[PDB]
Amino acid sequence: LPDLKIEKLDEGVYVHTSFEEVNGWGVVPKHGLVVLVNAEAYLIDTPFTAKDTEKLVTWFVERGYKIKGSISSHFHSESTGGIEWLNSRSIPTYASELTNELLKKDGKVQATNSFSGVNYWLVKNKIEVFYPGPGHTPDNVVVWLPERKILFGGCFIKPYGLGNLGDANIEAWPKSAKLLKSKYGKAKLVVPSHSEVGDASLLKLTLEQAVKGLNES
Numbered sequence: 001l002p003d004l005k006i007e008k009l010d011e012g013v014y015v016h017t018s019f020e021e022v023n024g025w026g027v028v029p030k031h032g033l034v035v036l037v038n039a040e041a042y043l044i045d046t047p048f049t050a051k052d053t054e055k056l057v058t059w060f061v062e063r064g065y066k067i068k069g070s071i072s073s074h075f076h077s078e079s080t081g082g083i084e085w086l087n088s089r090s091i092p093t094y095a096s097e098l099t100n101e102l103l104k105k106d107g108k109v110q111a112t113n114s115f116s117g118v119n120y121w122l123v124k125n126k127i128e129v130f131y132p133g134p135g136h137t138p139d140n141v142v143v144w145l146p147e148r149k150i151l152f153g154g155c156f157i158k159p160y161g162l163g164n165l166g167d168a169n170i171e172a173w174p175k176s177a178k179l180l181k182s183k184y185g186k187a188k189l190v191v192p193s194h195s196e197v198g199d200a201s202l203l204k205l206t207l208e209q210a211v212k213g214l215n216e217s
């Protein structure tokens with residue numbers, strides 16, 4: 001199985017890329033991010049594996065970066081596989097109230113730090129979390145990196161298909177993609193969860209794909 005990939009994306013923001021054979025297109029590259037406030041690192045989404053979380057973690061730890069915490073876009077393992085480990089390591093793990101009710105609903109270890117509402121600042125003016133509303137998952141959120149004008153749509157931003165409809169609010173995705181396409185259009189880059197990093201246009205295509213997605217069924 002493909003090795004973890006940590007590629008600087010922009011200033012103080014890396015794109016860790018884990019791979020889990022969720023039998024979709026076989027092996028899938030789950031793109032996450034490690035926002036480096038300054039001397040501190042934040043795992044935006046955690047690899048589906050503790051191992052990779054450990055690797056990603058120490059990769060940054062090893063380079064003098066204290067890991068203040070992780071933040072998950074949604075409850076799936078793509079974004080929570082490491083909360084467990086991160087928790088054993090006493091890493092402040094962050095997930096929405098809705099994701100945790102979902103993690104707890106799935107008997108998965110829940111992130112120790114919750115938060116709710118349309119928006120939550122994980123870091124005053126640097127790591128903004130956001131509930132565009134239901135979409136890929138009922139709890140799915142997106143993390144905006146104001147400073148770099150980078151958004152981590154994660155699995156919400158699905159520009160070429162809606163992907164896993166399993167836990168998706170096909171009826172609410174559009175509304176969400178629009179509330180999203182409306183709040184973060186100032187975006188310089190949008191970070192999907194399985195596609196190359198695109199620009200503010202991904203917010204529109206996700207919308208299109210969502211309505212499109214809805215039109216069918």
Ligand SMILES: [Zn+2]
Nearest residue numbers: 074076078155
């Ligand atoms: Zn997902």
Ligand SMILES: [Zn+2]
Nearest residue numbers: 078155193194
């Ligand atoms: Zn996904």
